[PDB]
Design a protein around this nucleic acid. Structure first.
Ligand SMILES: [Mg+2]
Ligand SMILES: [Mg+2]
Ligand SMILES: [Mg+2]
Ligand SMILES: [Mg+2]
Ligand SMILES: [Mg+2]
Ligand SMILES: [Mg+2]
Ligand SMILES: [Mg+2]
Ligand SMILES: [Mg+2]
Ligand SMILES: [Mg+2]
Ligand SMILES: [Mg+2]
Ligand SMILES: [Mg+2]
Ligand SMILES: [Mg+2]
Ligand SMILES: [Mg+2]
Ligand SMILES: [Mg+2]
Ligand SMILES: [Mg+2]
Ligand SMILES: [Mg+2]
Ligand SMILES: [Mg+2]
Ligand SMILES: [Mg+2]
Ligand SMILES: [Mg+2]
Ligand SMILES: [Mg+2]
Ligand SMILES: [Mg+2]
Lengths: 134, 260, 226
RNA sequence: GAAACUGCGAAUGGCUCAUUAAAUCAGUUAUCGUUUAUUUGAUAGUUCCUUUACUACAUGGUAUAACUGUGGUAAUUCUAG
RNA sequence: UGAUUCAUAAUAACUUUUCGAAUCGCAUGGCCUUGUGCUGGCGAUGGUUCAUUCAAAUUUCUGCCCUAUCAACUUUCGAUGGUAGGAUAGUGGCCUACCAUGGUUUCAACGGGUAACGGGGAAUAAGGGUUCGAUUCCGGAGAGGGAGCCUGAGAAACGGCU
């Protein structure tokens, strides 16, 4: 009753990356910026794939409202979506857990600290421990 | 200074790649290869920008490392491999073959050819010379050394290379009255027949080329590529056939085609 | 000073802090690689023959082998020399090394026992340190165990058992330079490639010579008519 | 799969405009005056010292890192036996 | 090829004799004296030479601000040229040896200043001009000042060394 009426323009079939890539035009009057969950569900039901093989990104809604334009991908399988899709956007869709690393500064500082050790550092640690014991 | 350069600035790229001014400071510097840097088209520019098959360069890498693309029958997994003029690009998935030929605006066109035409290419003879152990070789415009050529093959001729066994199937001489594909300059992409070749011993032999609409133009012989006889080209010509309509006739075509 | 004494035939080594410098003027003004007798060094090293193999002075600078000169100098050290490890390709560093002449400014000598004495030292001779790795190359295994030219080195590999409490397994290195059917296939492929490459080049040369003879006969026919 | 050996890269990028007035630089040439990793294409049946003295090719050798172990210096991306 | 002592081939030798695969992965087919015999596929990495590509180095012609209160400059100690060598990756006074006495200049040489890196360009726009351009692109130069070198295809490198 709210007339989301999603349509897909500029459809290109890509067997090279095993997907269909298109421009998602969302005409949503009396509604603001529908979601990507609704867009992935309602593109899954029209391209018959699954929810987790459909990927959407873009959606700059037009000035004055009532229309959002984006880009969309519908992969041939969930495994082929997880192979070819960026890890950030898999994290967006919940297909991948976010990797918990250190930050950029501590990663580079750890690298430059480890540049000062030649070898594994077991002998260095034993010598430093024994000499600093006396 | 100090060594070979490895970065190509955007705005220092060739203009026919049609890269947008914004979205990054750098352009894809082509690898070393068969074609010169400013007269070639890298695979990232062909796949991401012309065919729109990839959105990123990361996806161009993801396409090429599955050994999908192949240029001249060999796979070429490099992201910035210099696919230049006459090059046949086969995408085995999507079942299509492209020939990198210029459009008449001076740009590499998306030109789909058949699988029969994808089995060969054409090559402009750059030198005919005698190699070691007295063996004659011929060098084409894409760096191919082909041993034991026909003795009638001279410089500026065009050979037909078979792309599976890289031999000369046949060849076309450089005579008056044969088709030309102009591969350089402001007349780049134009197709016409040789009126005559003006000699100039000492440098820069000129060619007077006349197209199908009887418009003559003069081009240096570095930019002339013979593609066949009067009519009946050995390759399939792109859409437009190298005619160079003026801008008034171009807007006349656009208003006569968009009004239905 | 300390004496870093190593007895290499058992691989064992330890340090003796020798004070009371009457015992260590036997070392003084003697270079590296020179042999000394251990009676003047001590009663415990009686009959032993040490060879001075190196040492570190006070402030830790190493004894560079064969300089001269019991003081320190700064040498421009290169690759494949002692007392320097280059951090780049072709990098030389002006480092200060200490000379080969033993003086009183040494903190530790390095000595190798080249002749076992009368009594048995408590940390050098009674204990044997095993070598960490057995041989890995095929003919090195063959000359390690003295077998033959033709024998299966696979059955003579030193294996080591690794125990993680619940699980015990054995690991053997690899046989580098092992004569395998894969290596024979590769050799055969290279020979066949050379043979058929030469055959195809001769066939192309013969076909081109036939073409040249045909064109020469045609040119002679079209010239003799004139 | 840490380490370490090997390979490749570190000569690109980035910054700055101090020098510099036919010098740099611009357009235009020349290499029949040269070097060129990489890429791409082509390319190697001849290996016997003085053949009528061949020594494995079902495949030669040692010598080192990492590692073990013993250390020196207050200190270094120091290193010694 | 506009042009050669070019490409290339041949002859006599020469060489602290260069290269001519003792390398790795995957697949394990085919044949008959069934020996783990003979063959054999798709690649990876190497490798000599030529060509190509990325270049580099040098180079022809013409073009630069102010200054004569800068009219002669260069040539000791290479300045212009010849011959020969050395050196270079290679041309060349690049350097050396021996000769010749040249070379630039009122069409502004040489010197001095530049609060001068050069250019694409920028501001102002009747037209012509005037002024700016350290600065996002191209080329140069430099890493506190000079000099010297190692490794490497490429550096006189400076997040390389002396
Ligand atoms: Mg730079
Ligand atoms: Mg590149
Ligand atoms: Mg091996
Ligand atoms: Mg290395
Ligand atoms: Mg590389
Ligand atoms: Mg000479
Ligand atoms: Mg000379
Ligand atoms: Mg002289
Ligand atoms: Mg200045
Ligand atoms: Mg006015
Ligand atoms: Mg300027
Ligand atoms: Mg500027
Ligand atoms: Mg300034
Ligand atoms: Mg710059
Ligand atoms: Mg510099
Ligand atoms: Mg400073
Ligand atoms: Mg400095
Ligand atoms: Mg390198
Ligand atoms: Mg420097
Ligand atoms: Mg710095
Ligand atoms: Mg730098």
């Amino acid at each position: 009753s709210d007339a989301v009426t999603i349509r897909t323009r500029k459809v290109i079939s890509n067997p090279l990356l095993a997907r269909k890539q298109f421009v998602v035009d969302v005409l949503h009057p009396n509604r603001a910026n529908v979601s990507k969950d609704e867009l992935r569900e309602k593109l899954a039901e029209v391209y018959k794939a699954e929810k987790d093989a459909v990927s959407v990104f873009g959606f700059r809604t037009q000035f004055g409202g009532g229309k959002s334009v984006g880009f969309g991908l519908v992969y041939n399988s969930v495994a082929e979506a997880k192979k070819f899709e960026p890890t950030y956007r898999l994290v967006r869709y919940g297909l991948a857990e976010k990797v918990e690393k250190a930050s950029r500064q501590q990663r580079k500082q750890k690298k430059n600290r480890d540049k000062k050790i030649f070898g594994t550092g077991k002998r260095l640690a034993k010598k430093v421990a024994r000499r600093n014991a006396d | 200074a100090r060594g070979p350069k490895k970065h190509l600035k955007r705005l220092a790229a060739p203009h026919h790649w049609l890269l947008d001014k914004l979205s990054g400071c750098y352009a894809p510097r082509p690898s070393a290869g068969p074609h010169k840097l400013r007269e070639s088209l890298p695979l990232i520019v062909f796949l991401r920008n012309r065919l729109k098959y990839a959105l990123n360069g990361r996806e161009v890498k993801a396409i090429l490392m599955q050994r999908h693309v192949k240029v001249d029958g060999k796979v070429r997994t490099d992201t910035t491999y210099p696919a230049g003029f006459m090059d046949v690009i086969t995408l085995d998935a999507t079942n299509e073959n492209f020939r990198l030929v210029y459009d008449v605006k001076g740009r590499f066109a998306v030109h789909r050819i058949t699988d029969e035409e994808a089995s060969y290419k054409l090559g402009k003879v750059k030198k005919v010379q005698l190699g070691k152990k007295g063996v004659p070789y011929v060098v084409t415009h894409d760096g191919r050394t082909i041993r034991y050529p026909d003795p009638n093959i001279k410089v500026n001729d065009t050979v037909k290379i078979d792309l599976a066994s890289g031999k000369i199937t046949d060849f076309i001489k450089f005579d008056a009255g044969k088709l030309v594909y102009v591969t350089g300059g402001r007349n780049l992409g134009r197709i016409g027949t040789i009126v005559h070749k003006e000699r100039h011993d000492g440098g820069f032999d000129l060619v007077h080329i006349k197209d199908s609409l009887d418009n003559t133009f003069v081009t240096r012989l570095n930019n002339v590529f013979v593609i066949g006889e009067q009519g009946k080209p050995y390759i399939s010509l792109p859409k437009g056939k190298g005619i160079k309509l003026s801008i008034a006739e171009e807007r006349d075509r656009r208003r006569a085609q968009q009004g239905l | 000073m300390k004496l870093n004494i190593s007895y290499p035939v058992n691989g064992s080594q330890k340090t003796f802090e020798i004070d009371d410098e009457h015992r260590i003027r036997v070392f003084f003004d003697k270079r590296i690689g020179q042999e000394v007798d251990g009676e003047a060094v001590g009663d415990e090293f009686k009959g032993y023959v040490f060879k001075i193999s190196g040492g570190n002075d006070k402030q830790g600078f190493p004894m560079k082998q064969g300089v001269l000169l019991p003081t320190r100098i700064k040498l421009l050290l290169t690759k494949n020399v002692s007392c320097y490890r280059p951090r780049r390709d072709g990098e030389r560093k002006r480092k200060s090394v200490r000379g080969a002449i033993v003086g009183p400014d040494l903190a530790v000598l390095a000595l190798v026992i080249v002749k076992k004495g009368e009594q048995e030292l408590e940390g050098l001779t009674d204990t044997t340190v095993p070598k960490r790795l057995g041989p890995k190359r095929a003919n090195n295994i063959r000359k390690f165990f003295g077998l033959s030219k033709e024998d299966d080195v696979r059955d003579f590999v030193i294996r080591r058992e690794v125990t993680k409490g619940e699980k015990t397994y054995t690991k053997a290195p690899k046989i580098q330079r092992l004569v395998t059917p894969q290596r024979l296939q590769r050799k055969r492929h290279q020979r066949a490639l050379k043979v058929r490459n030469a055959q195809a080049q001769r066939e192309a040369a013969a076909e081109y010579a036939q073409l040249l003879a045909k064109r020469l006969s045609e040119r002679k026919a079209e010239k003799a008519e004139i």
